[PDB]
C-alpha cells in the first residue's frame, strides 16, 4: 500500500520481493504490474519478470502467467532460467484448454506452443510432462470429432452419420475410439437400410454388410459382438427378398 503510492521503485521492488517470499502473490502482483513498464530492460528485470510470471502461475491466472512467461523468454534471451519459462509458458496455456464440447481454440494454441517447445529444447527435463500434456490435448480434438459424428446417430439422421464417421475413421487414424466408431457406423447403415425406400434397399443392405466385416476384422472379439451378430441376421434375412 505505502510502496504502491510512493514513486520510489526501489522500495516498492523490495516490498514486492518480500510479498512474493511469503506467498503473498496476490498483493505482490498489484505492485509488480505498475513497476513492470518502468523496470523493463533494466539488468534486474530478469528477477522481477520471473517472479511476476510465477505469481500469476501460482494464482491460477494461467492466461496472464502464459503471456508473462512468453515475453520473459522473448525479451531476456539468455536468462539462466529461460528453459523453465518456456515450458511453464506452454504448460500454462494448456491448462486453459476447454472441454471437447466447447470451442477448441485454446487447445490448438497450446499444442503449437508445446510442440515448438519440444523441438526447440530437445532432451529437456520437462519432456516427460510435455508429452503427456500433448497426448491429453490431442484426445480432446479426437473426442470432439467423435462426439460430433456420434451426435447425428443420436438424433437419427443416419445418412449424415455415415459420412461423418467415414471422415473420422480417416482424419484420426490409430485412435482408441476406432472400435466404437466402427460399430456406430454399422448401426447407422443398419437403421438406414431396414427403414428405407424399397428402390435402394439393396444398396444400403450391402453397405451394412461391409461395415460389419470391417468391425469384425478390426477386433474379432469386439464388445458389441452380441448385438452386431443380431443386426447381421436381419440384413441377411432381408437380403433374401432381393435374391433375384
Amino acid at each position: 500500500q505505502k510502496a504502491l503510492k510512493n514513486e520510489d521503485v526501489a522500495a516498492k521492488f523490495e516490498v514486492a520481493t518480500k510479498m512474493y517470499d511469503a506467498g503473498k502473490y496476490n498483493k505482490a502482483i498489484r505492485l509488480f504490474e505498475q513497476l513492470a513498464p518502468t523496470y523493463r530492460g533494466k539488468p534486474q528485470a530478469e528477477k522481477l519478470f520471473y517472479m511476476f510470471s510465477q505469481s500469476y502461475y501460482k494464482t491460477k491466472q494461467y492466461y496472464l502467467a502464459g503471456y508473462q512467461f512468453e515475453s520473459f523468454v522473448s525479451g531476456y534471451p539468455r536468462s539462466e532460467k529461460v528453459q523453465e519459462a518456456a515450458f511453464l509458458g506452454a504448460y500454462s496455456y494448456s491448462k486453459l484448454a476447454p472441454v471437447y464440447s466447447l470451442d477448441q481454440a485454446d487447445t490448438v494454441k497450446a499444442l503449437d506452443k508445446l510442440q515448438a517447445f519440444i523441438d526447440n529444447y530437445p532432451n529437456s527435463e520437462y519432456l516427460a510432462q510435455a508429452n503427456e500434456s500433448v497426448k491429453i490435448l490431442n484426445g480432446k480434438l479426437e473426442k470432439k470429432a467423435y462426439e460430433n459424428a456420434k451426435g447425428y446417430n443420436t438424433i437419427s439422421d443416419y445418412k449424415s452419420a455415415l459420412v461423418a464417421f467415414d471422415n473420422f475413421i480417416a482424419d484420426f487414424p490409430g485412435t482408441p475410439l476406432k472400435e466404437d466408431a466402427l460399430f456406430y457406423k454399422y448401426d447407422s447403415a443398419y437403421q438406414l437400410a431396414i427403414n428405407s425406400v424399397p428402390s435402394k434397399m439393396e444398396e444400403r443392405l450391402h453397405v451394412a454388410q461391409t461395415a460389419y466385416a470391417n468391425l469384425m476384422k478390426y477386433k474379432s472379439d469386439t464388445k458389441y459382438k452380441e448385438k452386431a451378430d443380431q443386426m447381421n441376421a436381419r440384413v441377411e434375412t432381408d437380403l433374401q427378398k432381393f435374391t433375384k
Binding site: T154, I155, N167
Partner: protein
C-alpha cells in the same frame, strides 16, 4: 427508346429454354429495362427471390453463375443471350462450428439444416442461419457460414459456422394491443440453463449453463389482470427427438372488467395459482406433420368480493 427482343439462353443443360423463358417472363416488344433483367436473373435484395440463379443454387449447383450479354442492337431493338454456367453438383462434406465458448456443440449441431452428404442448397444455409439466430446465444449480425475446402472436381464443400457468443441471459420487453386494451410483458430469461448441474455449486455463474434449456421469470399485465410466472422449458426432452417439456408456476390477480365500457372495478377480484406441466412431440405416424400436445394442470381460485354474473360465492375458493 429501346425495346427487348430475341431473348435466348445458352448453357442451360439442366433446364430447357422453355422453362427458363417462363421464369424470366420477358416478351418481345417490351421496353428495355436493365434493372428488370438483373432482378429476374439474380435478385440480390432478397435471398428467397424467384430468380433463375436461385433455381440453380437451390438444387446443388453451387458454382452456378448467370450473366446477360447484349448480342445485337438494331432498329432500337436489343437482343440478349443469357449465359448460364451450371457447373458440377456439390454435396456437404464436413460441417463444423467455431466460436462457441460457452455453448456445447450438441446444442448447435442439432439445429443445423445443412446435413453432411446432402446436395448444396442456399435455402438450407439461410434456414440454418435463422435457426442459429433463434437460439439467442450468438450475435445476429455475425452468423457467417464460410465455405472451406471447396473441391469442384470431387463435388464436395465444407461449411464452417463462425459464431460470436453474446451471453445467454436476455431481457424481454414486449407490448401488444388486443381486446380493446393494451397489454405488456416484462421478464428475464436464461436460454442456456442446465438442470443437470443444478446441485453442482462449482459452476453457478449466472445460473448453471450448458444444455439449451430455458428458464424464464416474466411478468405480464393489462388493465384487468396481472400475472407473475416462472417457467422451465426443455427444447429436446430425451436428447433423441425435439420433444418439448415445459413446466410453469404462476400467480395472477384478475379484476372484474366490463369489456363493453372498458371500466374495471378494483374492489372485485380473484387470485389464480396454477401449476402446469406439458409434453409436446411431433408424431412420425400417420405422417410427420402431426404434433401431439399433452398437459396436466392444477389451479386454485381465490375469490375476493367477486359477486358478478353467475358468481354467487364471491368469497370462496375453487
Amino acid at each position: 427508346k429501346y425495346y427487348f427482343g430475341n431473348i435466348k439462353f445458352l448453357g442451360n443443360t439442366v433446364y430447357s429454354d422453355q422453362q427458363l423463358n417462363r421464369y424470366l417472363g420477358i416478351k418481345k416488344g417490351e421496353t428495355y429495362n436493365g434493372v428488370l433483367l438483373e432482378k429476374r436473373i439474380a435478385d440480390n435484395t432478397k435471398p428467397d427471390g424467384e430468380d433463375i440463379t436461385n433455381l440453380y443454387q437451390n438444387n446443388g449447383y453451387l458454382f452456378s453463375k448467370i450473366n446477360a450479354v447484349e448480342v445485337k442492337t438494331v432498329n432500337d431493338t436489343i437482343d440478349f443471350e443469357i449465359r448460364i454456367t451450371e457447373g458440377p453438383i456439390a454435396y456437404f462434406n464436413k460441417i463444423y462450428v467455431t466460436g462457441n465458448d460457452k455453448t456445447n456443440d450438441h446444442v448447435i449441431y442439432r439445429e443445423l439444416r445443412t446435413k453432411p452428404g446432402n446436395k448444396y442448397s442456399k435455402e438450407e444455409l439461410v434456414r440454418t442461419i435463422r435457426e442459429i439466430g433463434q437460439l439467442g446465444f450468438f450475435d445476429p449480425e455475425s452468423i457467417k457460414p464460410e465455405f472451406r475446402n471447396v473441391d469442384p472436381a470431387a463435388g464436395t464443400v465444407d461449411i464452417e459456422y463462425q459464431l460470436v457468443e453474446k451471453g445467454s441471459s436476455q431481457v424481454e420487453l414486449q407490448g401488444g394491443y388486443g381486446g380493446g386494451g393494451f397489454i405488456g410483458t416484462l421478464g428475464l430469461s436464461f436460454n442456456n440453463f442446465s438442470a443437470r448441474k443444478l446441485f453442482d455449486k462449482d459452476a453457478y455463474k449466472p445460473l448453471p449453463m450448458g444444455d439449451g434449456q430455458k428458464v424464464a421469470l416474466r411478468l405480464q399485465g393489462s388493465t384487468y389482470f396481472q400475472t407473475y410466472s416462472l417457467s422451465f422449458s426443455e427444447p429436446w426432452f430425451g436428447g433423441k427427438k425435439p420433444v418439448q417439456f415445459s413446466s410453469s408456476i404462476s400467480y395472477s390477480k384478475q379484476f372484474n372488467y366490463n369489456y363493453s365500457s372498458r371500466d374495471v372495478n378494483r374492489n372485485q377480484s380473484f387470485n389464480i395459482f396454477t401449476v402446469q406441466v406439458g409434453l409436446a412431440k411431433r408424431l412420425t405416424v400417420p405422417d410427420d406433420y402431426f404434433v401431439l400436445s399433452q398437459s396436466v394442470s392444477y389451479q386454485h381460485y381465490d375469490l375476493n368480493n367477486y359477486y358478478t354474473g353467475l358468481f354467487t360465492f364471491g368469497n370462496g375458493a375453487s
